[PDB]
Amino acid sequence: SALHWRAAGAATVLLVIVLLAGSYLAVLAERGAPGAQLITYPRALWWSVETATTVGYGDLYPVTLWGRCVAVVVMVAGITSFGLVTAALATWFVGREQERRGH
Amino acid sequence: SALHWRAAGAATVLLVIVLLAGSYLAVLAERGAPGAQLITYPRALWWSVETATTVGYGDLYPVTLWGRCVAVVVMVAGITSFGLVTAALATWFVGREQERRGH
Amino acid sequence: DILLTQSPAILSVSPGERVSFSCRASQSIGTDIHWYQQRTNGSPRLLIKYASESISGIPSRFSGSGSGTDFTLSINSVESEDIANYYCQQSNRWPFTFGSGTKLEI
Amino acid sequence: DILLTQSPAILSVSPGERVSFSCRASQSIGTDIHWYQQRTNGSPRLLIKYASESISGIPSRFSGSGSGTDFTLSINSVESEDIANYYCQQSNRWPFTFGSGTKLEI
Amino acid sequence: VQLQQPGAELVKPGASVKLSCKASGYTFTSDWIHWVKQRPGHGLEWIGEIIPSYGRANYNEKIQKKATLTADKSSSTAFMQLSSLTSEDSAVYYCARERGDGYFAVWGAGTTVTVSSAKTTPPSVYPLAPGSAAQTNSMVTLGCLVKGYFPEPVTVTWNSGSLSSGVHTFPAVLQSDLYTLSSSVTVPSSSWPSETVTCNVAHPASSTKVDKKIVPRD
Ligand SMILES: CCCCCCCCCCCC(=O)OC[C@H](CO)OC(=O)CCCCCCCC
Ligand SMILES: CCCCCCCCCCCC(=O)OC[C@H](CO)OC(=O)CCCCCCCC
Ligand SMILES: CCCC[N+](CCCC)(CCCC)CCCC
Ligand SMILES: CCCCCCCCCO
Ligand SMILES: CCCCCCCCCO
Ligand SMILES: [K+]
Ligand SMILES: [K+]
């Protein structure tokens, strides 16, 4: 079990937790703000998944300061995790190419 | 034929399939939901391409649970494939730099 | 906040007919509308959620439709027990808000 | 759902003139509007799709325009065979819905 | 002929009928079959849809649910189950095909559904030939009287479709559970007696189709 694979896996579990915590924290942060739409868990969760992936649909977003703070944590966690996987694939590709040359 | 290149290619074909399956599955999942717009194949396909790339135009998105589930598969497939290509380019660059040093 | 207008305040119908209640929202809210029934001296009772999802324990006689800014609660074959006040409720934007209510009269 | 209003229910015109049918949607739908012709005892016949795309086998006399919430079906040089009921249909949001219809009268 | 639908169906109040729509021609997996309701004199009302290559069906929720959609992939036939009908459910029901692109490129002739206690009655086709003492002009008018039939659909043709110009088929009139109409045909006076003229009358509900030649009176 290599480091890059363990990291990829740890990042996945971690991202899943961030999404969940984020879903809960967003509702708690947004309810109480007139016009807020990130006020129920089911869509908050869909919102966090679309924030971590940055898919950008524009159908849901935070309007309060803490929601936005929560939003940054999810964004960064998402961008970082998917980037870590990229790095884990590079380590894989570099290692087997080295083999295909002997070393 | 090196691994990283085969992977890049396999990822492309796979992503194309995901887009297509996703287009079909989204329509099947969204038709029946009042207000849904992801209800015809031509635009569903355009929607999947814009979801896999995360271009984020906000002109089309799923409103049902299965559509959203389909949406995640496409997002992840897209982000992952484009990241795999990045990794395949890194393996290329690292290998030829090693040559430019002898090894 | 979101204003929910309930068309005719009173609805008079004959036994057995199909009847429809109207709920107009001041802005697009998807399908985040819910209907409640309240009888004389009773408390509110959820009938339909998210505009059309039936609730367990509620007569199939009850159904809902619409999305965006126009919603309808329908009862196929009205009857005595259905005499009550009906209210819509939105959960799209925070303050939640309720409709003014519609009384069914046979 | 999306409401399609068809302006004058009846349209009376003289032989040879250009005539225009109106279809007003309750919300922006791009160009996802389609027109159908239905003669007495006949069935609907697609005339124009996506507001302006001509259909194979349809007289060039027929054309459509608009986008957003206002659509027009036009016939250059009306004639007997054109006497019928015309309907618009939207495919932008699910329930699909049809217009109330417009009868052409020469 | 894209959609093949039976001409008519008689139904007793409370009863239920099952309509069919047999398709053919270019068929894809992305095809949706739709059902539309048209009450006499009124507009088109979308009932529901079905995706055959999967069996998923969606219904218009703004109206009372009287339908149930189904499909048989092998016989390329779509079915609509109308249950516990009443006078309100009487109308013509069309089926259409949609290539997942949002417009109905092709429709079925439609099936006239009638809901009443009355019994199926085939019509009586009587000829309409001028009176022995009626002057003539370059044109001569003949016709034939379809009388005493119930379920409303009757199709009148002249010379089994070969004659279409100069034809008028008036709307049936209902009186005491029986419809009645007349159809008129006009040909040049110089060619009637000579060249025969026959009115064909098909009555879907009774699976009949009588012919009746129009010859001069005694
Ligand atoms: C010139 C450099 C930029 C300086 C910007 C000012 C400092 C930032 C916030 C001040 C908060 C306030 O008093 O206002 C809250 C605001 C309005 O009430 O609403 C808001 O909720 C906007 C919050 C923006 C959140 C940004 C999160 C970044 C991780
Ligand atoms: C506190 C942590 C977050 C918990 C969130 C609750 C559990 C999640 C969904 C419950 C579904 C339901 O009963 O509701 C469906 C919903 C409303 O009917 O509509 C929806 O379709 C929202 C679905 C969100 C999909 C998210 C997909 C993620 C890959
Ligand atoms: C395939 C779309 C990839 C979009 N990315 C990665 C999103 C990962 C969730 C956006 C990064 C934003 C910091 C990469 C730049 C794309 C121009
Ligand atoms: C950094 C911790 C998460 C942001 C704080 C959320 C507070 C929600 C409101 O109580
Ligand atoms: C995980 C499989 C794809 C999501 C399910 C799609 C179902 C569409 C509706 O029938
Ligand atoms: K993006
Ligand atoms: K966007």
mmCIF file of C-alpha atoms in Angstrom, chain E:
data_model
loop_
_atom_site.group_PDB
_atom_site.id
_atom_site.type_symbol
_atom_site.label_atom_id
_atom_site.label_comp_id
_atom_site.label_asym_id
_atom_site.label_seq_id
_atom_site.Cartn_x
_atom_site.Cartn_y
_atom_site.Cartn_z
ATOM 1 C CA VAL E 1 -48.318 4.874 -41.217
ATOM 2 C CA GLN E 2 -46.511 5.652 -38.041
ATOM 3 C CA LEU E 3 -49.393 5.344 -35.563
ATOM 4 C CA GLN E 4 -52.266 2.876 -36.113
ATOM 5 C CA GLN E 5 -55.139 3.477 -33.706
ATOM 6 C CA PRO E 6 -58.515 1.713 -33.722
ATOM 7 C CA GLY E 7 -61.283 3.990 -34.974
ATOM 8 C CA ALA E 8 -63.554 3.722 -31.946
ATOM 9 C CA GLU E 9 -64.402 2.226 -28.558
ATOM 10 C CA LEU E 10 -67.785 2.198 -26.807
ATOM 11 C CA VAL E 11 -67.665 2.216 -23.010
ATOM 12 C CA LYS E 12 -70.290 1.981 -20.298
ATOM 13 C CA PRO E 13 -70.063 4.386 -17.347
ATOM 14 C CA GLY E 14 -67.781 2.984 -14.664
ATOM 15 C CA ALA E 15 -66.236 0.545 -17.147
ATOM 16 C CA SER E 16 -62.703 0.806 -18.524
ATOM 17 C CA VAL E 17 -61.131 0.446 -21.981
ATOM 18 C CA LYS E 18 -57.578 -0.143 -23.237
ATOM 19 C CA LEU E 19 -56.480 1.789 -26.336
ATOM 20 C CA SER E 20 -53.674 0.727 -28.654
ATOM 21 C CA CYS E 21 -51.192 2.514 -30.889
ATOM 22 C CA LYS E 22 -49.141 0.306 -33.196
ATOM 23 C CA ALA E 23 -46.071 1.991 -34.598
ATOM 24 C CA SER E 24 -43.690 1.209 -37.459
ATOM 25 C CA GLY E 25 -40.930 2.843 -39.455
ATOM 26 C CA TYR E 26 -37.757 4.256 -37.978
ATOM 27 C CA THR E 27 -37.768 3.285 -34.301
ATOM 28 C CA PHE E 28 -35.114 4.362 -31.804
ATOM 29 C CA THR E 29 -34.469 3.736 -28.095
ATOM 30 C CA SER E 30 -34.924 7.444 -27.380
ATOM 31 C CA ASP E 31 -38.517 7.370 -28.626
ATOM 32 C CA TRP E 32 -41.376 8.578 -26.445
ATOM 33 C CA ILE E 33 -45.022 7.826 -27.251
ATOM 34 C CA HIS E 34 -47.528 10.490 -26.110
ATOM 35 C CA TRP E 35 -51.292 10.477 -25.612
ATOM 36 C CA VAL E 36 -53.425 13.561 -26.181
ATOM 37 C CA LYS E 37 -57.089 14.109 -25.332
ATOM 38 C CA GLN E 38 -59.380 16.205 -27.548
ATOM 39 C CA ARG E 39 -62.991 16.756 -26.493
ATOM 40 C CA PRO E 40 -65.243 17.650 -29.466
ATOM 41 C CA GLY E 41 -64.951 21.330 -30.308
ATOM 42 C CA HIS E 42 -62.195 21.942 -27.764
ATOM 43 C CA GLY E 43 -58.413 21.958 -27.767
ATOM 44 C CA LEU E 44 -55.639 19.474 -27.136
ATOM 45 C CA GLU E 45 -54.859 18.198 -23.632
ATOM 46 C CA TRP E 46 -51.622 16.334 -22.941
ATOM 47 C CA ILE E 47 -52.302 13.130 -20.987
ATOM 48 C CA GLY E 48 -48.968 11.396 -20.481
ATOM 49 C CA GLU E 49 -45.943 9.786 -22.036
ATOM 50 C CA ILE E 50 -44.045 6.507 -22.087
ATOM 51 C CA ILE E 51 -40.481 5.551 -23.012
ATOM 52 C CA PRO E 52 -40.971 2.029 -24.529
ATOM 53 C CA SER E 53 -37.337 0.872 -24.382
ATOM 54 C CA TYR E 54 -37.542 1.219 -20.588
ATOM 55 C CA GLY E 55 -41.234 1.303 -19.709
ATOM 56 C CA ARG E 56 -41.102 4.546 -17.737
ATOM 57 C CA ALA E 57 -44.284 6.635 -17.866
ATOM 58 C CA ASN E 58 -45.132 10.188 -16.791
ATOM 59 C CA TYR E 59 -48.620 11.663 -16.358
ATOM 60 C CA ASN E 60 -50.072 15.146 -16.426
ATOM 61 C CA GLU E 61 -50.727 15.841 -12.746
ATOM 62 C CA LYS E 62 -53.080 18.810 -13.215
ATOM 63 C CA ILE E 63 -55.951 16.539 -14.240
ATOM 64 C CA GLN E 64 -57.637 13.501 -12.698
ATOM 65 C CA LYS E 65 -55.593 10.370 -13.379
ATOM 66 C CA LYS E 66 -57.761 8.068 -15.490
ATOM 67 C CA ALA E 67 -54.917 6.629 -17.596
ATOM 68 C CA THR E 68 -52.167 4.029 -17.278
ATOM 69 C CA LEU E 69 -49.456 3.775 -19.918
ATOM 70 C CA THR E 70 -47.748 0.570 -21.028
ATOM 71 C CA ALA E 71 -45.768 -0.717 -24.002
ATOM 72 C CA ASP E 72 -44.980 -4.024 -25.732
ATOM 73 C CA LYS E 73 -41.523 -3.781 -27.322
ATOM 74 C CA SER E 74 -42.041 -6.852 -29.536
ATOM 75 C CA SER E 75 -45.255 -5.735 -31.273
ATOM 76 C CA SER E 76 -44.176 -2.078 -31.171
ATOM 77 C CA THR E 77 -47.515 -1.220 -29.592
ATOM 78 C CA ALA E 78 -48.257 1.367 -26.931
ATOM 79 C CA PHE E 79 -51.292 0.969 -24.664
ATOM 80 C CA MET E 80 -53.429 3.354 -22.628
ATOM 81 C CA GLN E 81 -55.703 2.024 -19.893
ATOM 82 C CA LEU E 82 -58.616 4.402 -19.211
ATOM 83 C CA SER E 83 -60.398 3.366 -15.986
ATOM 84 C CA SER E 84 -63.829 4.130 -14.499
ATOM 85 C CA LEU E 85 -64.906 6.531 -17.235
ATOM 86 C CA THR E 86 -67.811 8.991 -17.381
ATOM 87 C CA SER E 87 -69.279 11.405 -19.950
ATOM 88 C CA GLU E 88 -66.283 13.665 -19.281
ATOM 89 C CA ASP E 89 -63.924 11.011 -20.609
ATOM 90 C CA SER E 90 -65.690 10.918 -23.994
ATOM 91 C CA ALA E 91 -63.455 12.283 -26.755
ATOM 92 C CA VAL E 92 -60.891 11.481 -29.426
ATOM 93 C CA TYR E 93 -57.590 10.195 -28.039
ATOM 94 C CA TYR E 94 -54.503 10.631 -30.222
ATOM 95 C CA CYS E 95 -51.117 8.986 -29.745
ATOM 96 C CA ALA E 96 -47.968 10.619 -31.109
ATOM 97 C CA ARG E 97 -44.284 9.828 -31.467
ATOM 98 C CA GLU E 98 -41.520 12.044 -30.119
ATOM 99 C CA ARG E 99 -37.825 11.535 -30.881
ATOM 100 C CA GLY E 100 -36.815 12.973 -27.489
ATOM 101 C CA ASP E 101 -36.542 16.363 -29.196
ATOM 102 C CA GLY E 102 -39.753 17.803 -27.786
ATOM 103 C CA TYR E 103 -42.156 17.988 -30.725
ATOM 104 C CA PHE E 104 -44.684 15.503 -32.067
ATOM 105 C CA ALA E 105 -43.518 14.777 -35.595
ATOM 106 C CA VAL E 106 -46.224 12.182 -36.140
ATOM 107 C CA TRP E 107 -49.745 11.481 -34.912
ATOM 108 C CA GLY E 108 -52.237 8.645 -35.052
ATOM 109 C CA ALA E 109 -55.630 9.076 -36.732
ATOM 110 C CA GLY E 110 -57.051 9.021 -33.216
ATOM 111 C CA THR E 111 -59.593 6.785 -31.505
ATOM 112 C CA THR E 112 -63.054 8.160 -30.782
ATOM 113 C CA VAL E 113 -64.098 6.976 -27.332
ATOM 114 C CA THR E 114 -67.763 7.206 -26.417
ATOM 115 C CA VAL E 115 -69.169 6.604 -22.943
ATOM 116 C CA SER E 116 -72.885 5.789 -22.714
ATOM 117 C CA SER E 117 -75.321 2.991 -21.914
ATOM 118 C CA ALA E 118 -76.566 2.832 -25.517
ATOM 119 C CA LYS E 119 -75.820 -0.199 -27.696
ATOM 120 C CA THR E 120 -73.725 -0.442 -30.850
ATOM 121 C CA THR E 121 -75.909 0.024 -33.923
ATOM 122 C CA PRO E 122 -74.616 -0.157 -37.518
ATOM 123 C CA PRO E 123 -76.041 2.507 -39.856
ATOM 124 C CA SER E 124 -78.564 2.291 -42.682
ATOM 125 C CA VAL E 125 -77.204 3.728 -45.922
ATOM 126 C CA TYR E 126 -79.935 5.052 -48.233
ATOM 127 C CA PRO E 127 -79.199 6.568 -51.683
ATOM 128 C CA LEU E 128 -80.062 10.139 -52.675
ATOM 129 C CA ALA E 129 -80.930 10.479 -56.361
ATOM 130 C CA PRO E 130 -82.708 13.481 -57.966
ATOM 131 C CA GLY E 131 -86.450 13.446 -58.551
ATOM 132 C CA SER E 132 -87.537 12.390 -62.051
ATOM 133 C CA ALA E 133 -88.682 15.979 -62.671
ATOM 134 C CA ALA E 134 -85.624 18.033 -61.711
ATOM 135 C CA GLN E 135 -83.906 20.184 -64.339
ATOM 136 C CA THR E 136 -80.154 19.721 -64.813
ATOM 137 C CA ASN E 137 -77.076 21.890 -65.368
ATOM 138 C CA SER E 138 -73.415 21.160 -66.188
ATOM 139 C CA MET E 139 -73.232 19.573 -62.714
ATOM 140 C CA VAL E 140 -75.425 17.024 -60.920
ATOM 141 C CA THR E 141 -75.704 16.501 -57.169
ATOM 142 C CA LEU E 142 -76.040 13.079 -55.589
ATOM 143 C CA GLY E 143 -75.642 11.947 -52.004
ATOM 144 C CA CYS E 144 -76.399 9.190 -49.530
ATOM 145 C CA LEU E 145 -78.080 9.076 -46.112
ATOM 146 C CA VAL E 146 -76.286 7.325 -43.229
ATOM 147 C CA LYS E 147 -78.965 6.899 -40.564
ATOM 148 C CA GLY E 148 -79.566 5.353 -37.153
ATOM 149 C CA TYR E 149 -76.046 4.436 -36.002
ATOM 150 C CA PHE E 150 -74.687 5.037 -32.529
ATOM 151 C CA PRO E 151 -70.974 5.239 -31.659
ATOM 152 C CA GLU E 152 -70.196 8.507 -33.489
ATOM 153 C CA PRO E 153 -67.485 7.560 -35.899
ATOM 154 C CA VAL E 154 -68.557 6.864 -39.502
ATOM 155 C CA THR E 155 -66.308 7.421 -42.518
ATOM 156 C CA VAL E 156 -67.890 8.231 -45.869
ATOM 157 C CA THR E 157 -66.032 7.940 -49.182
ATOM 158 C CA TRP E 158 -67.100 8.007 -52.822
ATOM 159 C CA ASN E 159 -65.988 5.305 -55.268
ATOM 160 C CA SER E 160 -63.792 3.988 -52.470
ATOM 161 C CA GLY E 161 -61.738 7.164 -52.216
ATOM 162 C CA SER E 162 -61.247 7.743 -55.955
ATOM 163 C CA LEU E 163 -63.811 10.580 -55.889
ATOM 164 C CA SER E 164 -62.944 13.417 -53.489
ATOM 165 C CA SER E 165 -63.885 16.676 -55.211
ATOM 166 C CA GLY E 166 -67.403 17.986 -54.739
ATOM 167 C CA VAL E 167 -67.867 16.119 -51.466
ATOM 168 C CA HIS E 168 -69.506 17.402 -48.244
ATOM 169 C CA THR E 169 -70.147 15.132 -45.263
ATOM 170 C CA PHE E 170 -72.326 16.967 -42.739
ATOM 171 C CA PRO E 171 -71.831 16.536 -38.950
ATOM 172 C CA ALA E 172 -73.994 13.810 -37.429
ATOM 173 C CA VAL E 173 -77.117 14.881 -35.529
ATOM 174 C CA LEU E 174 -78.051 13.008 -32.365
ATOM 175 C CA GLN E 175 -81.597 12.141 -31.391
ATOM 176 C CA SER E 176 -82.753 9.361 -29.102
ATOM 177 C CA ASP E 177 -79.414 7.524 -28.952
ATOM 178 C CA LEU E 178 -78.815 7.461 -32.728
ATOM 179 C CA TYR E 179 -76.652 9.640 -34.971
ATOM 180 C CA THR E 180 -77.570 10.562 -38.537
ATOM 181 C CA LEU E 181 -75.787 12.423 -41.326
ATOM 182 C CA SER E 182 -75.743 12.958 -45.065
ATOM 183 C CA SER E 183 -72.906 13.207 -47.522
ATOM 184 C CA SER E 184 -73.123 14.899 -50.885
ATOM 185 C CA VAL E 185 -71.064 14.465 -54.021
ATOM 186 C CA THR E 186 -71.145 16.568 -57.197
ATOM 187 C CA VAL E 187 -70.040 15.404 -60.631
ATOM 188 C CA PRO E 188 -70.644 16.681 -64.154
ATOM 189 C CA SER E 189 -74.233 15.854 -65.183
ATOM 190 C CA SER E 190 -72.971 14.411 -68.454
ATOM 191 C CA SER E 191 -71.120 11.633 -66.643
ATOM 192 C CA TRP E 192 -73.234 10.379 -63.735
ATOM 193 C CA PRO E 193 -75.589 7.710 -65.036
ATOM 194 C CA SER E 194 -72.795 6.697 -67.437
ATOM 195 C CA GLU E 195 -69.970 6.351 -64.929
ATOM 196 C CA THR E 196 -71.185 4.786 -61.678
ATOM 197 C CA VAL E 197 -71.091 6.637 -58.339
ATOM 198 C CA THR E 198 -70.965 4.697 -55.061
ATOM 199 C CA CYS E 199 -70.821 5.946 -51.475
ATOM 200 C CA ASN E 200 -68.871 3.749 -49.042
ATOM 201 C CA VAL E 201 -69.667 3.897 -45.349
ATOM 202 C CA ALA E 202 -67.393 2.357 -42.733
ATOM 203 C CA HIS E 203 -68.609 2.248 -39.136
ATOM 204 C CA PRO E 204 -65.601 1.310 -36.904
ATOM 205 C CA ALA E 205 -67.600 0.468 -33.786
ATOM 206 C CA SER E 206 -69.615 -2.238 -35.536
ATOM 207 C CA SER E 207 -66.704 -3.350 -37.720
ATOM 208 C CA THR E 208 -68.890 -2.760 -40.776
ATOM 209 C CA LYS E 209 -68.520 -1.027 -44.135
ATOM 210 C CA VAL E 210 -71.481 -0.972 -46.498
ATOM 211 C CA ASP E 211 -71.510 0.156 -50.135
ATOM 212 C CA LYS E 212 -74.410 1.752 -52.005
ATOM 213 C CA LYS E 213 -74.496 2.617 -55.701
ATOM 214 C CA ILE E 214 -76.424 5.717 -56.747
ATOM 215 C CA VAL E 215 -78.634 5.027 -59.747
ATOM 216 C CA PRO E 216 -81.537 7.094 -61.110
ATOM 217 C CA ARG E 217 -85.054 6.435 -59.799
ATOM 218 C CA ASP E 218 -87.273 3.804 -61.512
#
